[PDB]
Every structure is written in C-alpha cells, then in structure tokens.
Ligand binder design. Structure first.
Ligand code: ADP
Ligand code: VO4
Ligand code: MG
Length: 706
C-alpha cells in the first residue's frame, strides 16, 4: 500500500526518523518516502528521493533480510551482521568471477573482482580502502578480499602462495589483535597488503606493511580489556609442551603484565585459536627454532613483569632473583648481567664506562620499556619473515592494495595511542573527501564539461592541520622531548597556550570518568585526551646496557631483533620520535594511495552491544553522516560518474547503429542522437563522453541484446 504524497519520513528524538509540515506517525503521536519498487535497492543513487531517512531505512530494510552490502553511488556500504552468513562460500566466489558490478548483488567479492578488471583494463594499480569505527567490519572484509583473490588464483609443511597469503592474517592476529571494549578482536595496528599481479592477471606475489603497534598493551590493560591474544592462547594449555618450555603456570592472574583487566572472552576459544596460530606459522614456512624462539620471547615478557625491586640516594636492588632467572634463560642471557644492567646502566667515558644509578621507579619503567621493545621488534620480524616467504620473484606488473587500519575509538581513558589511531581515521576520511568531491569535479573542468563547483562541506583540513602541521599537537610533543626539564604540565601548558581559543578543533576537556586534559573535535566525535606520559611514550628510550646484552644473546631471534640498534649518538665538542615517524609513514601511505584507483568500502557498526540484526538508528546515522554517504551519493547523481573515451565508445557501441560511421568524437555524437535516449543524460568532453547516473547501464543493456 502506497500513497505518493502522504507517506513521508518525520524526525524523531529516539529513533532519528520514523515512517508516517504537520501529520501523525504510524504509531500515534504527531521528506517523501520512496515507492515500494525501490525497497531493498542495490544502489541508493537510483532512489527517487534522497535524504537521510531514505538511505537509513533502505540500509535497515536490507539488513533485516541479511543483505549486509549496498552500493551508494560509486562506492559501497556494509553493516556488520554480528553473525555468520552463507554469502562467503567458495561456490559464491566462483560465480562472482568476471561479472560487471550490476550483474550480481552488492558484495565485497564484486568490489574485488571489479578492482581486478579495472587493473587489467586500464593498466593501473588499484586499492581497496575499508573505513569504519572499532568493530565495524574492516578486518573481516579485508580477509574476504584476500580470500576472493586467493580462491580465484587457486583455480589456475609450507603450502602454496595462495594458502600463505590467507594464513598471514591469523598469524599476525595472535600478536597484534586484542580484546578492547568495542571489539573482542580489535586490530591494534594498521596494515596495507599489496597483492601483485603479472601483465596478464596471474597472482604473482604479495607483501604486508604494518603501521604503529599499540606497545602499551603488552604491559598495561584497562578494566574492560585484555592484553594481546597470544598470551591467553599459550595459557590455554591446548599445547602443554609450551607451558613447560616457557616455564609458566596456566593462570593469567599469576602475571601482572597481562592480568590487569579481563582474562577470558566469551566469543573467543583461546584453545582452538592457539592451534590456528601455530598452523599458520607452519604453513608460512616458520621452522621449529623460529616458532619456539617467538614463544620463548613471549614467555620471557611474562616473567619480566613479575620481577620485584627494592631499595639498597635511592638505589634499586633485585627483590628476589626467582623471575629474572626464568626470563634470562628463555632469552639466552646471563641473569646477573641483566639485573646489573637494569639497576646499574653504563655511561660511555670514551673507551671506558661508569655506571649511573636507578631507583625502583626508574628500573620498573626500563623493565616495562624493554618488554615493549622486544614485543614490537618481534612483531616487525614476523612481518618481515611473512613477506620473505610471500616474495615469489615471479614476474609482476600491477598490484591491488588493501587497507585495514585500526578503527576510530573512544575509551573512558584516551591517551597517545588513541590520538595516533584516530588521526589516521581522520586522514583516511579526508582521502575519501578529496577523491570524491575535489578530484571528481576537477575532472569535469579538465574535460571541458559545463559545471559549477558544488561545496559538499567535506573537508577536515582544520583538524588534520591541528595535529600534524608545525606547532600542532604532534609538533609540540616532538619539541617537548629532548628537553629534560620538560614535564607533563609544560607540554599541557604549551598545547593550551598555542591552541585554546586559537584552534576550533581544540577545546577544554568535557569530563566519575577518568581525568582528561584536552578535547579534540574529530570527524566522528569529541575525544577527551589524557597527556600523562606522552613525552616518554614519544621518546621511547631504552636501557642500552640491556639492549647490548640482547645483541650478544645466545638466541638468534633476540640478537637479530636488536642487531641494527640506533644507540644514542656519540657526544661532540659543543633522532626520530614516534609521532614524527608515524606522520612520515601516514603521509608516505596517503601519497602512495593517490597513485592508484581507490575503491571505498564503508563499514557501519549497527549497535553497541554486539547484537546480531539489531540496528540502532542514532548510531547508524552518526556514521553515515561523518562518513559522507549522502554527500557521496549526491555527487554520483548531480555529476557524471561514468565516462568513456571516444575510441572505446565506438569500439563497443558501434554495433547499436553502424549507419552512424570517421572521427572519434564526431562519430560518437552521431551515434548517441540516433538512439531513443534522453539527450540531456550525457555531455561531450575533450576526450571522453560523460554519462549521467544510469545511462551506461541502458546502453550496455542494448549492447547485450544484439
Ligand atoms: N561480514 C561479517 N560477517 C560476520 N561477522 C562479522 C562481519 N564483519 C564483522 N563481523 C564481526 O564483528 C567483529 C568485529 O569486526 P572486525 O572485522 O574485527 O572489525 P574492525 O576491524 O573494524 O575493528 C568480528 O570479529 C566479527 O565477530
Ligand atoms: O576494532 V578495530 O580492528 O577497527 O581497531
Ligand atoms: Mg580490525
């Protein structure tokens, strides 16, 4: 039943919008709805009415029938079903091969296949960029893109390249993923995977690049969160030989470094996951000495935390050598030299040395710091090793990169790690804004198309400039290190003096919950940051006397993790910080993505309680707004999303009317007027015919008939 004029969408203070400027709703109490033909539409740029509730309800409609993918113009939107669906089967993978976007339902498999098609067709590198906040579905979709390519390639101990490519994700997940409030399997690092293809489309090889790992997790947890998965998988006891080799109990609560918050997760079987983790290292080519060395280092990290200290000026001395000895043998170090290094670190006196002193607070920091450094270097080594076996040295030509970054998050306590994660999210959103709204309209101008630049309001340059540009939050932090008389409050005072009242995205902390020092107006919300410990987190210093012992370790792995160590430069007669390298890497990635054809996949978390099928309209609308889904749909409708080179237009559509044809542009003008179409649905460019939304599909329908 449908009444074109009285069926409207009206606002609501609890449900955002409701089905129904004065009328009463379907329930009782006191923007046009789309017809029943556009129910569960596969592409929302084809809806007659385009507004916030038209898109919200179409997504909701499809979500109710477990259709978690929907095209929204030139890109795609996905809503986390929070449950398994029979839409990722090998049978499905095969059917999607070679199909045009409109010839199959919306799917991540269709994005992957079309990215493959554009690569070989245009002779151009591609990229698949998955956005969304913590627990939206970026990693799940990243794994399905890889699955699609690996299954397609497979058509034609250690396994084949296709098997290795798939297993690289569960191998890295044990060490780099952990349970946070928002996600039981949160990626605590970003990763860009490039899948290389030869000149004719053969999957040649692959590589992975990881971006900043949350080191703090290794030695610190908040009430509602766990440390990295790996620790609990080892303690599961499904492989009891590991507990004997690592010299450990089966109780996480016996290890402070890993038992500060939660220890078991309802959705994760830690026992089955240890086997999956181990099987991946096997399939990836990891030797037993390699696997055991990695397990041994993880074990040494656990004992390292239980090491107690005491007073002997305040000087620290070991409060029991029990835990240091266990750590030292797993690491291949002499226990006495380790504790002497931690308590009395060397100072170079030219060719001699004098030891400086430490107190139990200083040694406690250095101990935590080294356990983080080892963990970070182990993760970087695992990636290097995965890349080493993934390198096939087979002929390559193009690549399809896939970006799975750590999602936007807000915790009750936000620190340095959150600012780095959320900063990347702001940057990736701005990548989308620039590509969709700035470059797109500049193409129309380049091609001599009649057009008036539209302002979509999509521009986060103010917040990005606030964080990265000189005298920004990172620049202030970078200066405040390598200034020993600088404290947490000199950094706070410098941030406020430069940005309070001067930067719109820098506000006083809103603030029961933990104490915050400043607020930041991010693209998806105001985040209250706590600046305590930022100067030390950014400088990341290490006890170089203990690092020296690590380089001389009897374990090959520990000595290789520290072989190329940037030991503090020699003094002269009179360095790269964390944030500095992170910005450098983020800009390196953004410029690299500019040299590819991007394919945006926008993930939407439907509810805060990980409930399948439950859609919370205020949370969904917040995401669709800050993502720019409506803005991104309008540029598809209001512009010309499809454009064909005059040559290609005659090579393909000459069959529609051979009477029309000997010029490239002139011939194309004759062909188009000769057909029964709206002659306003297209424009003529310098080198391409620009088509309005949908006209390409109409001509392609007519081409398939004859
Ligand atoms: N397409 C999907 N099908 C089924 N479950 C999904 C899907 N996408 C996400 N999930 C569930 O949601 C969780 C969070 O998704 P994940 O990919 O880890 O998100 P993100 O990487 O954005 O943090 C997953 O671990 C899984 O339980
Ligand atoms: O939960 V996330 O993997 O998006 O960080
Ligand atoms: Mg993830």
């Amino acid at each position: 039943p449908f009444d074109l004029k009285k069926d409207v969408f009206v606002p609501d203070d609890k449900q955002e919008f409701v089905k129904a400027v004065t009328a009463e709703t379907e329930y009782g109490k006191t923007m046009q709805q789309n017809p029943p033909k556009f129910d569960k539409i596969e592409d929302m740029a084809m809806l007659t009415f385009l507004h916030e509730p038209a898109v919200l309800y179409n997504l909701k409609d499809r979500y109710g029938s477990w259709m978690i993918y929907t095209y929204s113009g030139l890109f795609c939107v996905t809503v986390n079903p929070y449950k398994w669906l029979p839409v990722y089967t090998p049978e499905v993978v095969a059917a999607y091969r070679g199909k045009k976007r409109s010839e199959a339902p919306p799917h991540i498999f269709s994005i992957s296949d079309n990215a493959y098609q554009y690569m070989l067709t245009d002779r151009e590198n591609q990229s698949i960029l998955i956005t969304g906040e913590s627990g939206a579905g970026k990693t799940v979709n990243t794994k399905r893109v890889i699955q699609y390519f690996a299954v397609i390639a497979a058509i034609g101990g250690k396994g084949t390249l296709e098997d290795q490519i798939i297993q690289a994700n569960p191998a890295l997940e044990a060490f780099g993923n952990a349970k946070t409030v928002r996600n039981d399997n949160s990626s605590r690092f970003g990763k860009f995977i490039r899948i290389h293809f030869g000149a004719t489309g053969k999957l040649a090889s692959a590589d992975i690049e990881t971006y900043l790992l949350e080191k703090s997790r290794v030695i610190f947890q908040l009430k509602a969160e766990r440390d990295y998965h790996i620790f609990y998988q080892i303690l599961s006891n499904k492989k009891p030989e590991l507990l004997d080799m690592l010299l450990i109990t089966n109780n996480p609560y016996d290890y402070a470094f890993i038992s500060q918050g939660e220890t078991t997760v309802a959705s994760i079987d830690d026992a089955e996951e240890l086997m999956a983790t181990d099987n991946a290292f096997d399939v990836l080519g990891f030797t037993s000495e390699e696997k055991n060395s990695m397990y041994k280092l993880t074990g040494a990290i656990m004992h390292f935390g239980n090491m107690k200290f005491k007073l002997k000026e305040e000087q620290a001395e070991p409060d029991g050598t029990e835990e240091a000895d266990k750590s030292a043998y797993l690491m291949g170090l002499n226990s006495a030299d380790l504790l002497k290094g931690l308590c009395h670190p060397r100072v170079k006196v030219g060719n001699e040395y004098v030891t400086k002193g430490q107190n139990v607070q200083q040694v406690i920091y250095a101990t935590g710091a080294l356990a983080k450094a080892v963990y970070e270097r182990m993760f970087n080594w695992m990636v290097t090793r995965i890349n080493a076996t993934l390198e096939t040295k087979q002929p390559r030509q193009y690549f399809i990169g896939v970006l799975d970054i750590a999602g936007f998050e807000i915790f009750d306590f936000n620190s340095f790690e959150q600012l780095c994660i959320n900063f990347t999210n702001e940057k990736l959103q701005q990548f989308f804004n620039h590509h969709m709204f700035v470059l797109e309209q500049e193409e129309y101008k380049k091609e001599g198309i009649e057009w008036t630049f539209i302002d979509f309001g999509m521009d986060l340059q103010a917040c990005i400039d606030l964080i990265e540009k000189p005298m920004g939050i990172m620049s202030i932090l970078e200066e405040e290190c390598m200034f020993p008389k600088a404290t947490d409050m000199t950094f706070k005072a410098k941030l406020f003096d430069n940005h309070l009242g001067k930067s719109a995205n820098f506000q006083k902390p809103r603030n029961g919950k933990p104490e915050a020092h400043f607020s930041l107006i991010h693209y998806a919300g105001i985040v209250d940051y706590n600046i305590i410990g930022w100067l030390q987190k950014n400088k990341d210093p290490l006890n170089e006397t203990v690092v020296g012992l690590y380089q001389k370790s009897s374990l090959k792995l520990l000595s290789t993790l520290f072989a190329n160590y940037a030991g503090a430069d020699a003094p002269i007669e009179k360095f790269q910080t964390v944030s500095a390298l992170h910005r450098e890497n983020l800009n390196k990635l953004m410029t690299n993505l500019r040299s590819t054809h991007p394919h945006f996949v926008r993930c939407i978390i439907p509810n805060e309680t990980k409930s399948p099928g439950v859609m919370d309209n205020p949370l969904v609308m917040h995401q669709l707004r800050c993502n720019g889904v409506l803005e991104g749909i309008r540029i598809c409708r209001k512009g010309f999303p499809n454009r064909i080179l005059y040559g290609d237009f005659r090579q393909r559509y000459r069959i529609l009317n051979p009477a029309a044809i000997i010029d490239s542009r002139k011939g194309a003008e004759k062909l188009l007027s000769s057909l029964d179409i709206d002659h306003n649905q297209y424009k003529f460019g310098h080198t391409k015919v620009f088509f309005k939304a949908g006209l390409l599909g109409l001509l392609e329908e007519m081409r398939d008939e004859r």
